[PDB]
Design a protein around this ligand. Structure first.
Ligand SMILES: CC(=O)N[C@@H]1[C@@H](O)[C@H](O[C@@H]2O[C@H](CO)[C@@H](O)[C@H](O)[C@H]2NC(C)=O)[C@@H](CO)O[C@H]1O
Ligand SMILES: CC(=O)N[C@@H]1[C@@H](O)[C@H](O[C@@H]2O[C@H](CO)[C@@H](O)[C@H](O)[C@H]2NC(C)=O)[C@@H](CO)O[C@H]1O
Ligand SMILES: CC(=O)N[C@@H]1[C@@H](O)[C@H](O[C@@H]2O[C@H](CO)[C@@H](O)[C@H](O)[C@H]2NC(C)=O)[C@@H](CO)O[C@H]1O
Ligand SMILES: CC(=O)N[C@@H]1[C@@H](O)[C@H](O[C@@H]2O[C@H](CO)[C@@H](O)[C@H](O)[C@H]2NC(C)=O)[C@@H](CO)O[C@H]1O
Ligand SMILES: [Mg+2]
Ligand SMILES: [Mg+2]
Lengths: 369, 369
C-alpha cells in the first residue's frame, strides 16, 4: 500500500510550535511526499513562496534517509481557483508550454512527479469543455512523461491528480474511464464532506452515511465516494483514500442541541496556530479535548465528535484512522493520503500520543515500515 | 504596493455587455476589493440591494481564488449624503451601535474590513463638530477591531476611508495627523477634479496643473492633492492615489473652441450602458473614440481628452495611468485605488486592449502579480 503525505509550504509561518518545515518530517512515515503548492504564470509552473527552492531541497533531501521515498510537486489547490487552468488547457500550444515547463521544473528541483490539484474542471467558473480538456491535458502529460523518460534515460515522472469528493463536482469534472488510464494515482479528497457552510453539524470524513440520510445527503461519506470512483471506471489499485488530520468546527445555536445535524451559526471558531475560522489541526483538537470537551463516538459513521459549551467539532482520531485504514485495505484500494502532515502532532507535545500519532497509525496499519 | 479596486452593486443592472457581477472580476488583478455600498438603518450597517447577500458571497468567494486577496465593505458614497453619518457619530452610544453592527456584519458575510466613504464630514449639511467626531469614530473602530482579532484568533479587520480631493472639503472634514494614525489606508479621491458643474472643460484627474492656472484652480490636480495630504500629516505609505476608470463629459458652447478651459453648457449625454449624464465608462469611451472623435494629449497634465462635434471628454487611458503609476511609485505612496473595476473594459470587447486594460496597466506597473 502507499501512504501519500501532503506538506504545505505556508505551515512555516504558523506561530510558535506550529511552525513546520520539511526537516520536521520523519522520512520513514510515508511512501510518497507531496509538496503543496506550486503556482502558474504565463502557462508555466512556478514557485509561490520566497524560499520554495530551499524547501524543495530540504524536502527532496529526505530521500537521503529513505531510499524508497518518492516526492511529487502539487500544482493548484483550493485557493488557486480555476481561471489559470482553464486558460492553460484551452489550446494545444498552452498545454505544451505548461507540460514542457513542468518537465524542466520537476527534473531541476528533484521531484519524481506532478500532482494536479485543479479544484475543479467544470466547476467554480470553469466552463463545461474543461471536463474533456482535463482528460486531454492528463493524456498529453502522461505521453510527454513517457517520452522524457526515453529522452533522459531516467525512470518516468509520475502524473497524479487530487480529485473531488463531491458527486456534483465529480460529474461536472472527470471522464473517469479515460482519465484513469493515464493517471498513475487518483487522490480522492474524501474530506470536507460536512462543515459550517451547511448550517448544521456533521462529520468531516465519515466512513458511512448517517442512518437517516437519504438521497444526495447519503453521498457524503468515504464509502460512497470511493465506490463511486471505482464503479465509474477507476481501478481500485489506483484509488487513494483521503484522510484529514484536521477537523471542522461549528458554533451551536443552542448548546443543548449537540448531536449530528444540530443547527449551527456562523463560520466556526479559529485555533491559535492555524488561525482560520472553521477548522483545527489535530494538535489543536487535542488541546480542546484535554480541557474537558465531551467526546462522543459516532458509531454509525466510525468517527468521533466533541463539544464544549456552544463549540462543536467533527474530526478524526487514532480509532477512526484505524477503522478507515482497515476498510480501505479490505476494499483493495491502493492506499491512503493525508491532508496534511503539518497538522498532525508532529512534536508529540500536544496529544501525549507520541510523535505524528495520526500518520503513525496509518504507517502501522498499511505496513509501510 | 497595494491595488485597491472598487466594485459597485448597481453595475449588475446595466444592459447586455455592461452587466457586471463579482464573478466577472479577475481575482488576481488587485490586492484589495471594496464592495460599494452598504447602507445604514438605526445606526447599524445594512444591505441596500435585493440580492446583496448573494453578491456578498460571490464577492468574498473571490478570496478562494487568490490567497493574497482581501475584501472590504464600503459604507456611504456620494448619493448617501451625510445625515445618517452625523446622527451615528453624534453620541458614543450610536457609535458603539454602529461598530458592533459592523463587526457582526463583516464576520457574518466574509469581509476583511470596512471602508468609510462619508462625503463629507463637515460639508454637505454635516456640522463642524463632525470633523473631530469622525476621528473619534475611526479611533473607536480601530480599537474594537484590534480587540476582536485577539479574541477570535484571526487576522484583524481593517478600517480604511475614502477622503476628499477638494481642498475646502479636506480642511472642513479631516484631522489629518490623528486620523492618519488610526486608519489602515487613506483612499484619496483624486478624481472629479473638474466637471461640467464648473461651466468649462477640464480634466477628471490631471497629474499636474495647467500652465495658465494660478488661483484655486491650481489645487485641482493629483500632484497638489496628494502632497497636501502628505505634508499635512499623512504618511506616504498609507496614502492611496485615486485612479478613475471613467471620464467626464461636457457639451461645448462653441464646437470650434474645444481645448482645456473651453466654455460648456452642461453634462454630456448618458452612455448606453452606464446611463448617467456627465460621465462615460472607459469601455464607452473606446466606442466614442471609434465614432469620429478627435483625441488630444494634454501634455502639461499627462492626460488625454477627446471631442466630437459639441461633445467633450476629459478622461484617462493606458498612457495616463502609466505616467501616474510611475509618479506614485517615485513618491513612495502606498499604491493606487480604482473607481471602479466595472467601468474598465472587462470583456475586452470595446477597446482592443485586452480584458481589464486600465486595471491590468496598474497591476503591471505596481508589480502586483
Ligand atoms: C489535496 C488537497 O486536499 N487540496 C485542497 C487543499 O487546498 C485544502 O487545504 C486548504 O488549502 C488552502 C490553499 O489552497 C489553504 O489556504 C487552507 O488553509 C487549507 N485548508 C485546510 C483545512 O487545511 C484541503 C483541505 O480543505 O483540501 C483541498 O481543498
Ligand atoms: C461534498 C462537497 O462537495 N463538499 C464541498 C467541500 O468540498 C468544499 O470545501 C472545499 O473542499 C475541497 C476538497 O474538494 C478543499 O480543498 C477545500 O479546502 C474546501 N474548502 C473549504 C472552505 O473548506 C465546500 C466549500 O464551501 O463546499 C462543500 O459543498
Ligand atoms: C470611493 C468613491 O469614489 N466614492 C464616491 C462614489 O460614490 C462616486 O461614484 C458615484 O456613486 C454614485 C452613488 O453614490 C452613483 O450614483 C454614480 O453613478 C457614481 N459615479 C461614477 C462615475 O461611478 C465616485 C465617482 O464620482 O466618487 C465618489 O464620489
Ligand atoms: C475639487 C473638488 O472638490 N471637486 C468637487 C467634486 O469632487 C464633486 O464631485 C463628486 O466628487 C466625489 C468624490 O469626492 C464623487 O464621489 C461624486 O460622484 C462626485 N459627484 C459628481 C456629480 O460628479 C462636485 C459635485 O458637483 O463638486 C466639485 O466641487
Ligand atoms: Mg440535546
Ligand atoms: Mg479651435
Amino acid at each position: 500500500y502507499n501512504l501519500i503525505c501532503y506538506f504545505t509550504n505556508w505551515a512555516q509561518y504558523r506561530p510558535g510550535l506550529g511552525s513546520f518545515k520539511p526537516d520536521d518530517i520523519n522520512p520513514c512515515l510515508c511512501t510518497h511526499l507531496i509538496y503543496a503548492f506550486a503556482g502558474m504564470q504565463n502557462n508555466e509552473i512556478t514557485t509561490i513562496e520566497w524560499n520554495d527552492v530551499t524547501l524543495y531541497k530540504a524536502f527532496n533531501d529526505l530521500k537521503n534517509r529513505n531510499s524508497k521515498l518518492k516526492t511529487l510537486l502539487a500544482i493548484g489547490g483550493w485557493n488557486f481557483g480555476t481561471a489559470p487552468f482553464t486558460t492553460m488547457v484551452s489550446t494545444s500550444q498552452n498545454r505544451q508550454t505548461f507540460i514542457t515547463s513542468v518537465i524542466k521544473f520537476l527534473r531541476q528541483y528533484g521531484f519524481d512527479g506532478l500532482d494536479l490539484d485543479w479544484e475543479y474542471p467544470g466547476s467554480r467558473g470553469s466552463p463545461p469543455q474543461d471536463k474533456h480538456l482535463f482528460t486531454v491535458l492528463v493524456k498529453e502529460m502522461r505521453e510527454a512523461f513517457e517520452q522524457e523518460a526515453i529522452e533522459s534515460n531516467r525512470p518516468r515522472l509520475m502524473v497524479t491528480a487530487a480529485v473531488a469528493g463531491g458527486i456534483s463536482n465529480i460529474q461536472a469534472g472527470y471522464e473517469i474511464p479515460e482519465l484513469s488510464k493515464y493517471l498513475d494515482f487518483i487522490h480522492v479528497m474524501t474530506y470536507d464532506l460536512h462543515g459550517s457552510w451547511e448550517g448544521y453539524t456533521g462529520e468531516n470524513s465519515p466512513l458511512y452515511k448517517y442512518p437517516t440520510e437519504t438521497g444526495s445527503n447519503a453521498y457524503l461519506n468515504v464509502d460512497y465516494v470511493m465506490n463511486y470512483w471505482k464503479n465509474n471506471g477507476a481501478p481500485a489499485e489506483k484509488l487513494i483514500v483521503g484522510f484529514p488530520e484536521y477537523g471542522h468546527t461549528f458554533i451551536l445555536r443552542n448548546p443543548s442541541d449537540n448531536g449530528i445535524g444540530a443547527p449551527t451559526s456562523g463560520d466556526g471558531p479559529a485555533g491559535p496556530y492555524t488561525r482560520q475560522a472553521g477548522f483545527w489541526a489535530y494538535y489543536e483538537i487535542c488541546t480542546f479535548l484535554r480541557s474537558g470537551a465531551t467526546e462522543v463516538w459516532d458509531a454509525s459513521q466510525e468517527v468521533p465528535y466533541a463539544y464544549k459549551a456552544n463549540e462543536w467539532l467533527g474530526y478524526d482520531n487514532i480509532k477512526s484512522f484505524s477503522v478507515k485504514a482497515q476498510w480501505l485495505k479490505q476494499n483493495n484500494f491502493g492506499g491512503a493520503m493525508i491532508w496534511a502532515i503539518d497538522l498532525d502532532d508532529f512534536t508529540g507535545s500536544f496529544c501525549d500520543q507520541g510523535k505524528f500519532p495520526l500518520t503513525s497509525t496509518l504507517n502501522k496499519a498499511l505496513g509501510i515500515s
